[PDB]
């Protein structure tokens, strides 16, 4: 019962499947916290 044999099987089944047919989110998810990071990094820059 390891870990990286789960969680990698977890992926390649729930996130290959879905990630796949519902990679469409994936990018509406490429934006958001991903996006979020340098969103403010871009403001901050602004206030300094």
Do not use: F, N, T
Request: proline share 0%; hydrophobic share 40%; charged share 35%.
């Amino acid at each position: 019962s390891s870990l990286l044999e789960k969680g990698l099987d977890g992926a390649k089944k729930a996130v290959g499947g879905l990630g796949k047919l519902g990679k469409d989110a994936v990018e509406d998810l490429e934006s958001v916290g991903k996006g979020a990071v340098h969103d403010v990094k871009d403001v901050l820059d602004s206030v300094l």
